[PDB]
Subunit: 202 residues, 5 copies
Amino acid sequence: LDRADILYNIRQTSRPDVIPTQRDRPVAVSVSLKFINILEVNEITNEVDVVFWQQTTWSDRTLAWNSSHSPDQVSVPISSLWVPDLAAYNAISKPEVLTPQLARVVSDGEVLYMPSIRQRFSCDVSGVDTESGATCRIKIGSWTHHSREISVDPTTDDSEYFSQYSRFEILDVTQKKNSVTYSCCPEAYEDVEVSLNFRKKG
Amino acid sequence: LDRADILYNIRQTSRPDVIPTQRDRPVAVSVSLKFINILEVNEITNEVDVVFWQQTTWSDRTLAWNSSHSPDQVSVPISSLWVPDLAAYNAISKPEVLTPQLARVVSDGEVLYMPSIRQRFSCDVSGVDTESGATCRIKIGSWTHHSREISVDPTTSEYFSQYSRFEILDVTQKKNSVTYSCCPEAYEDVEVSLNFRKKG
Amino acid sequence: LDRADILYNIRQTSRPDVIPTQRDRPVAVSVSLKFINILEVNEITNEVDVVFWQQTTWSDRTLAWNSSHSPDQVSVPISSLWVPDLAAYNAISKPEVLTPQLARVVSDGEVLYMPSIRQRFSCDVSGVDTESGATCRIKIGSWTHHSREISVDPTDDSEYFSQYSRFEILDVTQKKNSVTYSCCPEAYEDVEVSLNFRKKG
Amino acid sequence: LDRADILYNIRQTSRPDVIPTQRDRPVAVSVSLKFINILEVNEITNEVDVVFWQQTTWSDRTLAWNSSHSPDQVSVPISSLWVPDLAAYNAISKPEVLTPQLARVVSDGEVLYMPSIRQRFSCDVSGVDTESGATCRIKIGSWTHHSREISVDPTSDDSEYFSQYSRFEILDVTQKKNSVTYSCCPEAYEDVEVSLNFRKK
Amino acid sequence: LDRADILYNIRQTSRPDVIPTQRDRPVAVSVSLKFINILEVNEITNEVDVVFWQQTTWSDRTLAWNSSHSPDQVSVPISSLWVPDLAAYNAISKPEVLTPQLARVVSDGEVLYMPSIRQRFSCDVSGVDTESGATCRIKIGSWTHHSREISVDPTDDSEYFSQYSRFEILDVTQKKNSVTYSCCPEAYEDVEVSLNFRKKG
Ligand SMILES: *[C@@H]1O[C@H](CO)[C@@H](O[C@@H]2O[C@H](CO)[C@@H](O)[C@H](O)[C@H]2NC(C)=O)[C@H](O)[C@H]1NC(C)=O
Ligand SMILES: O=C1CC2(CCNCC2)Oc2ccc(Br)cc21
Ligand SMILES: O=C1CC2(CCNCC2)Oc2ccc(Br)cc21
Ligand SMILES: O=C1CC2(CCNCC2)Oc2ccc(Br)cc21
Ligand SMILES: O=C1CC2(CCNCC2)Oc2ccc(Br)cc21
Ligand SMILES: *[C@@H]1O[C@H](CO)[C@@H](O)[C@H](O)[C@H]1NC(C)=O
Ligand SMILES: *[C@@H]1O[C@H](CO)[C@@H](O)[C@H](O)[C@H]1NC(C)=O
């Protein structure tokens, strides 16, 4: 199989509307934010404008091919794939995707999608001009799929990709799993809570 | 039936342009706003910028399937479904949808669509910096369907951002029925009264 | 005929690119602006930001159906219909459509399209802070169809206007105008809408 | 032939990706800007925000029909036509098209496309608040076609339809042809240079 | 072969989702930025707004045709072609493409795509108001293809820079990097562009 055949097969049999659940178990989605820049911070309004790489991984076995005498991986437009319906609960702007909308698909059906996103958030900016800094929390989960359909887990240096030219610096990033049941609904929804501890440079 | 079969059936037969009336009775649409944030307020221009979850429910029997060895619910792109043509009569910006445009469909044909929307409104901002606060009224109804085709009803604060400069004192959501001079038919609306103020 | 059949018939035989002229007569398009809000006014730059409902009516006999055991009217996405190519000659921003892009079609082929539009205009803002107020003129007509293909005709001025605007409406007049350009032998029709408004005391 | 037949024929056989060259000669494109407004000027940054009608004409013989007992002209969405790939070399914003994206096609295959465009330019704003005014030069040519594929030529008062309510007034508009060969490339590229002499009122 | 036949063949067979690797050797992409304008600089936030032509070249042998009695080159919409998935690693806005999205294809399968882009970057603006100026570095490479699939290589200093900018260019250097990240076993190639510029004053 060459690249042309694999990408033809995916384009022709891609059900992008269809969550790829196996034997009624949830799709395991891994999510990790790599912070690249903090552009605007407002301690009065408690708003931040951030650029991050949203590292997103999951398995879709319908994509898989035999890798013997074939590529191990191909680049696929996300319009030809199912992608998790992830949303940031405290976003106050739409995600601005800065990068080409391609994912990497491995021959075993693993998908890696990592867009660069600029987005604005409502979060705690208090203490940004102090030594211990501000802690801005961002919650990301499936908008419509509960824990029996999608599970979200943080992935396996917090400032390795962060811009040296930002007015801000990162003290710490922690990424932890939450499972929440709301009054509306009988089912639990999973989320990754990302805590960005940052401060103004002196 | 698996998810793949249900979503194929819905894509092939859903008729997104066709209001799903039963026996010439109106489609009963429920609408409730959950306020998440108040971002900008201008007492001079009487304008507010708000983020809310627009909880929207209705029945479309053409979507229904036998649930007996099948999923009870699926996620469906709204482009594959009929959705009510709701508009806010006092909006001064287009709705900015912040979330994926998917609805939940139950095997009995019940649809739940709850987008997160950022939108600007013309409303009474007077008293925002006082103890009793401002009361901003938002009217939402069908743009083109009168009360014999679509009825809009409220369902009868909790998720408001603790980090807003503002706080919510009260939200009331009440039904209105309006006849305009132009037109013989009544149009239903939910009137949402947001009583809010600047934090001390 | 039920709604599903009518909307199927319209979607399948809709020629949205084809002006529905009858026997070589112009399509009569009626246009009336209902002002809802005046958001920003600049007396230095002579610019206004306005929200209005653009009530637009015309007949397309290709849409018609026998109403006798059928709905009298349906809601149709404008992407399935011919719509007049109206433009505001003094607009300085694109029309921001705030409402769902549906028109109402009557069984006789009458169409009503009424979008809520926010748009910015170049017009006379002088006198806005005086008792007699400013008069801002907005000209709306077909961008590409002359008077033998499209005629544009006008149909309480403050019945829909926001009580919470910084401005108030004194008067709205909507009158028919005709432009002939040097380039072209044909006249292009427009509705001229005169918005007399002022800052509230 | 009626309008419906002509627009069907154009939709079914228009190759919008195919430049309509005749007998290996260039497509002759005429371009004339009609200035409507000057909205924002910055003498520090040397930037202007302008609204203009970009009158664009060319021949496409593949569109032609016999006009005997048929319309002389139809309105066609530009998505169904080849359009020249014109760009303003000193634009610093994308063209904001304010009008419906329809062209006029004449039965002989002449196309007229005249969008209303709002766009920002890098140009000489020095002297805008003096009697002799500023001269802002805008160059428009094909982005990808050299002079053997596309020629651009200028076409009465270019300023006749300028807004009386602008803070600015037009002193003079000149529109002249340039043909440039760059070091990169063996072929010549044509452009129309438009010089807008304007000042604050 | 005429233009119509070549563009039909490309539209029918191009495979825009398929990287045109030969015998599992990388696609050689050449990238060179031609700086046209520096619009906004902020020494506090270390941000610049720049307009540049992104000269991009590569070979796709599936596009090739016999040039005997045929055009040597055609203009092709990039939606009908594979294009490299290039991104600027320090961009803080999406690329605003100011030009028509057409590439030039030579009969041997060479592609030239040169969009005019306005984009904002995070980079070192310190020293912009001094004689030696600021040096802003921009890194451009494939977002998803490593060095075994795409290689990126640099190809007259600042001849097309706007004379009306508040800034002037002292020097542009464009050098190749090959980077291995901790996450990933493969090396990713990038062109690093160093823009040495200062305020004219
Ligand atoms: C729908 O079409 C029917 C079928 O021909 C029309 O019914 C006729 O109407 C005429 C004229 O009024 C009567 O005198 C005939 O007896 C009817 N014939 C039948 C077979 O019913 C009907 O008029 C049409 N409906 C409308 C609203 O025009
Ligand atoms: O109806 C829902 C579903 C949802 C929507 C947001 N994503 C998780 C699932 O959560 C809710 C939260 C609050 C309310 Br009220 C309703 C709801
Ligand atoms: O024709 C209508 C119907 C509509 C359109 C949008 N609002 C709900 C239903 O209401 C009208 C309001 C004013 C005028 Br005039 C005409 C109309
Ligand atoms: O060629 C035309 C026709 C048109 C163009 C768009 N609006 C109405 C019809 O009107 C013109 C206006 C001015 C000039 Br100059 C040419 C023209
Ligand atoms: O340097 C060039 C070459 C180019 C780039 C656009 N595509 C055709 C070839 O044409 C130019 C047009 C204007 C200017 Br200034 C420079 C140039
Ligand atoms: C993959 O292909 C090789 C080569 O034909 C074969 O030996 C291997 O077992 C295959 N596995 C499959 C088809 O699952
Ligand atoms: C191309 O066409 C010419 C003349 O028609 C001929 O010399 C040649 O064989 C053709 N094929 C190739 C691959 O050059």
